[PDB]
Each structure stands twice: as structure tokens, then as C-alpha cells.
């Protein structure tokens, strides 16, 4: 029985390694009526046509599972988009190498997909944990008018409730908005201290722009940040003593995609174990029908438990979001960046460097500034008042 | 006299036959000042995910579509996101009226404009509960399955119940796995004793529930199933809700179809006197624009309005009855926020719904 594994990559060279990772697979396992070959087909820059390549050559091959990949582009929802619907609407899982946008994890659209890589939206998991532990009991959030910042922004607060906290003060932006100097007011009066930044390069240009303009930046303030902003057009003007976050292997394909061959290299041997085993559907045209095998394809995909790749303990389970990653906290200091948190996936694991807070100052402040006058309601009783 | 080539596109033998006759009537039935209604037959082959965008943009190509209705005879809406894409690139207005909208598809992708003729899952747990306010049914329960979407549906009906004069009481949530077992699946339905039961569960996943439902003896007597969800074995105590154009003739189901995307740019017009880019590059402007311009459609003596996302603002709709002989008939009706029924009753009475304790109930005199 032939068994084909498809995949969608960028640039020649990377394709190559796909090759030798398949090459491996019949090697290290004792298959005999199981044989493995790799499709390769080259991204199209343009939406139009890109559906034509996979219909008529990755589809027609007959694929068990397909692999995505970053686009060129810095930041582009333009790979992932068209080879999740043609193939995600055949039953046809697919595998996500390089997807951590939060939006694909709704499943009214897209509705078979697995990731590789946790999103953006588990950031705020490790974020109360590490708030917790130091204090910081009053926060504020400053999230833009974008989908994937209402996951992050739910996510927080759908488990804060636990402490009986309403995150005190939540504002909202407009993205690719220059200045947002006038609504910082609202953020300076509150007594706390703490702000936490879940946007894009564009719309952290202007925050990060404008916090030193507004005396912002100086002692008794403390940044934590999400992880787009740290790396690109938002260092300008970043302020000093940043604590933000990380993803290990965030840019390392070669090593992503060793591990979604390993988990679907066990999980054909299990395949081929069953009754009603149907074969998924040879071309784009002929067939007009969802295959037989559907969610169990699937049961099997989300089940696997094993410690291999440079990674390993892969638990894909749920939406297909993967659990426990390895993060890292790093810090900036004179323009330069530096790694002083490491993440082992259970606890925060800090470092003996010396973690230097916003502003030049090294003593560990707190979310909280005491209100000096007070306003008072009084009504009028003959007696009393 | 600003020229429109509309285009219109159906799939399935059944139209073929009638492609042609469409024509002079959805011409007549569409008139407005200073447009052009030209329309054009076309015939797609299949309902699948399939190579439409080869032949979707060859046509478009080269042709002032401007806008194309979208229909097709199935039930499954595994057509709607793939043709959701292509439209985000034309950035043109795509509506389905019968069979393409099953179901409301979203949140969307950016820039999309394709807008559908259907209910949304939260205006279909409005009526379930208007209907239910007059005709008492307070206990109830809800049953889920492993079809996606279903935290959203716990979710709606929570909402609703809690902050109530009435003070609905609930019976907890029941969740069943069809893949695990019979066994399994008896013993959770009837867990709970109620004769009033929500159901959510995909189509094709519904006949193993009914399954489960037979042998677990919750099928006789005075039962109450509601139909709520994507869409012989089939015992009655059956109900669900629908669209008002539940039975809407062919002809005018295209009418109302073509009826949006012509009538509802006529008020460009008024300010001054498009979106063929696919096979073109360099190009990609604003499509945020049109979702605003489409908000004000009323025919047929109905309203019609949609959000950003797009569907129906103001869904007048009717409440399908119980099915006895295989029929769809319809008993509930509702209009401008208000409810209308067809058959006023009291309590439970004769042929609607007897109760299931006969010897639990007393009729006392005063």
C-alpha cells in the first residue's frame, strides 16, 4: 500500500531536508507493506493560482496529511489560508509547522487542523503564573481592536476570576493608529503600575513611542510584553528593563518538521490496524463525497504520547494546541537583548543576572500607588448630617 | 442607466432544465431607477471542494458580473468558505439563498463581503423560548454532542435563562460520546427523567442518538425533541426553527437573491454618478465599505438587515410544527420582535402534546 505524505515548504533548499526526514522514517521503523514518498510544490506569490497547485497536484497524489510553512513575507495570513480549505474540507488533516496565529483555532472554519507550535494566545497562560508569584496583584490591559487580541484578552481574564479580580482597568485601540497619546491619560491616574502590551509592530510603534514622551519609562514602571514587538521596528525606542517573552525553536524548521514526521510515522502503523480503512480520495475532480473515515482519523492524530525530536513530549489534544512549551524571558538593556528567564514548561525557572526593572532602578516595585484625597457621598439627615 | 451584467450560477440537473425560464422573470421582477438588470444563466458542475476557482475567475474575467447569486441543492455547506476565499480577492458581494447559506459562517476572513440568507444559532434559541414562555414547559434540558460549536450553544442558553422574572430552572448539561458506546449512550440520556429535551448534533450524527433514545425509552408517551443545530428511525416529539422562506418558490427565492446585491447599490448613486482584479495584481484598496452600504433591504413584507460579519439582523422567520407524516408543517410565526401563533392552547390538551402522567394529574373545581 502506498502512503503519501504531502507537504507545502518555502525555498528549494528547505524541501531537500523534507526528503531525508521521510527517508528515515521506513528505516527506523519495521513497516514492510508500508512504503513513504515526499510531494514537493513551491509556494505561489499570489492567491488566485494557489488553489490550482494543490488541487491538481498535491490532492490528485493522494496525501496522508499535508505540512505548512512560513511564508517569505515577514507577516502574511497568505500560506496557510488556502491549503487548509481545499484539503481541510476533504477530512484531509493538516499539519501546522510554522502556524501560531490565534485565529485558526475556531473550528467553524478550518475545521480539521493540528499545530505544532503553541499561538500567541497561550502567552497570557505563563503571564498570570509569573504575575502571580511576584505580587503584582493590579494590573492594566492595553489590547488593540483586533480578533487575535480579544483571545489573548479572554484568556486572562477567563481564569482570573479564580482570585475573585476584574483586571482593574482594560483599554481598547484601533490598529494602525500613529497616535494614541491622549487616551494614555485614562492609564496614569489608576493606582497600578503594571501594564501588559498584547499587539503588533504597528500599533506598539506608537505605544512604545510616546511612553518616554509621557514620563512613562522612569522608575516605579514595569513593562510585560508580548513576544512580536520585542524583535523589529518596535526597538526605536523601547524602554529599558523589558520583561518579555520567547518560544524556543519559534524559526526552526528543519527540526519541526522531523517531529510531525515522527508523530504521523507511529500513527500509520495504527491506521493500518482497523476495520473500514478507506483510502482518501485519489484527485480533485472525481470524488464528491467526505471520505469514510473521519473524526478517527483525527482520534488517533490527537492521541500521540512519546519523547522524540529535540523538542519531544508531544501531547497534541483538544483544539490541537500544543501543550507545556519551553519559553524564555529576556531582558533589554543598552539596545542589547539578553536572555535571564528560562521556561520549563510547569514553573518560571529564573536566573542569577541581575534583572534590572524600567527606568534604572533595581528594587522590585509594586502595582500599587496610594490615592492622597479622597472623594465622599453624604446625604442629608436631620441628626446626623 | 449605469450598465449591470448580474451573473447567476446554479448547480444541479434540476436546474438546467429551468435556467432558461429564470430569465424574463428575474428581469421583470427586478426594476430600479438608473440600473441594468442583464442577467446570465450559468450551470456549475458538482457541490465539493473542487477547482471552482479555475473556472469561477475564467468567467468573471473578461465580464462585468459585478455580482452573482449562488445557489446549489445540497445540504452539507462545504461549498460557502471555499468560495468565501475567492470572493475576499474580487472583494465582490457573493449571497446564497438556498443550500449555499446552511449556516452562518463565522467570524470571517478580513475584507470579506459575502453575506448569507439564514438564522444564526443565537437567533434560533430566541423563538425556542418566546414559543415556550406562553405555553409553560418549564423544565428542560440540554443534550450535546461532540460536533464543534457546541460551547457556544451551552453558553446562549445560559444567558438567556438567568435574569428572569419567570426563573427558568435547569437540569443540568448531558453530554454523549456516539463513538463509545450503546451502552454508554442509553445510560446518560435517560440519567435525567424530563420530558423536555435540547438537542445539538450534526446530520448525519442525529441517527445514532435516536438510537440510544429507543431502547432507553424516552421515544413514547409525551417526549419533546428540539431540532436545533447544523440542520424511519424518526419517532414523533419532534420540533425545530427555520426561515420564512421555508417554501419559497424558485423564481422569487433568486429574485430575493438578486434583489441585494442590485437594489442595495443604487444609493451610490445618489452621491455620484469595480472589483474585477482577479487574474490582475497590484491592487487591493478597501472592502470594508460595502457591509455599511447593504444595511437597508426590506421586500416581500419583510425586513432585511445584516451586521459586519452578515446575516440577518432582523430574522422574520416561522417555527416549523411537529411532524407527523413526514411533512414540514409550520404552526409559529415571528414579526417585527413579536410573537403570533396559529393554535392557542392551555395547559396540555387533546392531540397537542397529552400529558405523560396520567395519573399524576387532577382537575379540581373551585
Redesign the interface.
Known amino acids: 500500500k502506498i502512503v503519501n505524505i504531502g507537504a507545502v515548504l518555502s525555498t528549494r533548499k528547505h524541501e531537500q531536508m523534507f526528503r531525508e526526514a521521510v527517508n528515515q522514517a521506513n528505516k527506523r521503523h519495521g513497516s514492510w507493506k508500508i512504503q513513504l514518498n515526499a510531494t514537493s510544490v513551491t509556494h505561489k506569490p499570489?492567491?488566485?493560482?494557489m488553489?490550482?497547485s494543490v488541487?491538481?497536484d498535491l490532492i490528485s497524489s493522494q496525501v496522508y496529511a499535508i505540512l505548512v510553512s512560513h511564508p517569505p513575507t515577514p507577516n502574511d495570513?497568505f500560506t496557510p489560508?488556502?491549503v487548509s480549505?481545499?484539503?481541510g474540507?476533504?477530512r484531509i488533516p493538516v499539519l501546522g509547522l510554522t502556524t501560531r496565529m490565534s485565529?485558526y483555532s475556531?473550528?467553524?472554519?478550518h475545521?480539521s487542523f493540528l499545530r505544532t507550535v503553541p499561538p500567541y494566545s497561550h502567552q497570557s497562560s505563563v503571564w498570570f503564573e509569573m504575575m502571580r508569584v511576584y505580587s503584582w496583584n493590579h494590573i492594566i490591559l492595553l489590547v488593540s481592536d483586533d480578533?487575535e487580541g480579544r483571545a489573548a484578552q479572554k484568556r486572562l481574564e477567563t481564569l482570573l476570576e479564580e482570585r475573585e479580580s476584574k483586571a482593574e482597568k482594560v483599554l481598547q485601540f484601533d490598529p494602525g493608529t500613529k497616535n494614541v497619546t491622549a487616551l494614555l491619560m485614562e492609564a496614569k491616574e489608576l493606582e497600578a503600575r503594571v501594564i501588559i502590551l498584547s499587539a503588533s509592530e504597528d500599533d506598539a510603534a506608537t505605544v512604545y513611542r510616546a511612553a518616554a514622551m509621557l514620563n512613562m519609562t522612569g522608575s516605579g514602571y514595569v513593562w510585560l510584553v508580548g513576544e512580536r514587538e520585542i524583535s523589529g521596528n518596535a526597538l526605536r525606542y523601547a524602554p529599558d528593563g523589558i520583561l518579555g517573552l520567547q518560544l524556543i525553536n519559534g524559526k526552526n524548521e528543519s527540526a519541526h518538521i522531523s517531529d510531525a514526521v515522527g508523530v504521523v510515522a507511529q500513527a500509520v502503523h495504527e491506521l493500518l490496524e482497523k476495520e473500514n480503512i478507506t483510502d482518501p480520495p485519489r484527485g480533485?475532480?472525481g470524488?464528491?463525497?467526505?471520505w469514510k473515515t473521519g473524526?478517527?482519523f483525527k482520534?488517533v492524530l490527537m492521541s500521540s504520547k512519546y519523547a522524540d525530536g529535540v523538542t519531544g513530549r508531544v501531547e497534541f489534544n483538544e483544539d490541537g494546541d500544543r501543550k507545556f512549551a519551553n519559553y524564555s524571558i529576556m531582558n533589554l538593556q543598552n539596545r542589547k537583548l539578553v536572555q535571564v528567564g528560562i521556561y520549563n514548561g510547569t514553573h518560571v525557572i529564573p536566573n542569577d543576572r541581575k534583572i534590572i526593572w524600567p527606568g534604572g532602578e533595581t528594587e522590585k516595585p509594586r502595582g500599587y500607588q496610594m490615592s492622597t484625597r479622597l472623594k465622599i457621598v453624604t446625604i442629608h439627615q436631620e441628626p446626623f448630617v | 442607466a449605469r450598465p449591470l451584467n448580474v451573473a447567476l450560477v446554479f448547480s444541479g440537473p434540476a436546474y438546467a432544465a429551468e435556467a432558461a425560464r429564470l430569465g424574463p422573470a428575474v428581469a421583470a421582477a427586478v426594476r430600479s431607477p438608473g440600473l441594468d438588470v442583464r442577467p446570465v444563466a450559468l450551470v456549475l458542475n458538482?457541490?465539493?471542494?473542487?477547482?471552482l476557482?479555475?473556472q469561477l475567475?475564467d468567467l468573471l474575467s473578461g465580464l462585468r458580473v459585478h455580482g452573482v447569486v449562488f445557489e446549489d441543492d445540497s445540504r452539507?455547506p462545504?461549498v460557502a468558505?471555499?468560495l468565501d476565499?475567492?470572493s475576499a480577492?474580487t472583494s465582490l458581494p457573493i449571497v446564497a439563498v438556498h443550500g449555499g447559506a446552511a449556516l452562518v459562517?463565522?467570524?470571517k476572513?478580513?475584507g470579506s463581503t459575502f453575506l448569507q440568507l439564514g438564522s444564526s444559532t443565537e437567533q434560533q434559541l430566541q423563538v425556542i423560548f418566546e414559543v415556550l414562555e406562553e405555553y409553560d414547559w418549564t423544565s428542560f434540558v440540554a443534550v450535546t454532542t461532540?460536533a464543534?460549536?457546541h460551547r457556544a450553544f451551552l453558553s446562549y442558553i445560559e444567558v438567556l435563562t438567568d435574569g428572569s422574572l419567570v426563573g427558568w430552572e435547569h437540569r443540568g448539561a448531558l453530554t454523549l460520546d456516539p463513538?463509545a458506546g450503546e451502552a454508554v449512550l442509553s445510560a446518560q440520556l435517560r440519567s435525567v427523567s424530563a420530558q423536555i429535551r435540547l438537542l445539538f448534533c450534526a446530520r448525519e450524527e442525529a441517527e445514532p442518538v435516536f438510537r440510544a433514545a429507543e431502547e432507553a425509552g424516552l421515544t413514547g408517551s409525551g417526549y419533546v425533541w428540539f431540532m436545533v443545530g447544523p440542520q424511519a428511525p424518526l419517532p414523533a416529539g419532534l420540533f425545530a426553527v427555520r426561515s420564512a422562506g421555508w417554501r419559497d418558490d424558485l423564481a422569487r427565492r433568486v429574485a430575493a437573491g438578486v434583489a441585494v446585491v442590485a437594489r442595495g447599490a443604487q444609493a451610490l448613486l445618489r452621491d455620484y454618478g469595480l472589483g474585477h482584479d482577479?487574474?490582475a495584481?497590484n491592487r487591493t484598496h478597501r472592502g470594508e465599505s460595502l457591509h455599511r452600504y447593504f444595511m437597508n433591504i426590506t421586500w416581500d413584507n419583510r425586513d432585511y438587515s445584516f451586521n459586519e460579519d452578515g446575516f440577518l439582523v432582523n430574522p422574520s422567520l416561522v417555527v416549523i410544527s411537529l411532524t407527523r407524516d413526514r411533512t414540514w408543517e409550520v404552526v409559529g410565526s415571528w414579526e417585527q420582535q413579536t410573537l403570533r401563533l396559529k393554535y392557542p392552547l392551555w395547559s396540555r390538551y387533546g392531540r397537542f402534546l397529552q400529558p405523560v402522567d396520567d395519573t399524576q394529574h387532577l382537575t379540581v373545581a373551585t
Request: glycine share 4%; proline share 10%.
Open positions: 499570489n492567491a488566485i493560482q488553489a490550482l488541487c491538481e495570513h489560508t488556502p480549505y481545499t484539503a474540507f476533504y485565529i475556531d473550528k467553524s472554519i475545521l480578533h480533485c475532480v470524488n464528491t463525497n467526505i473524526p478517527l482520534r | 458538482g457541490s465539493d471542494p473542487r477547482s476557482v479555475l475567475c452539507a462545504a468558505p471555499i476565499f475567492l480577492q459562517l463565522t467570524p476572513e478580513k461532540r464543534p460549536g463513538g482577479c487574474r495584481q
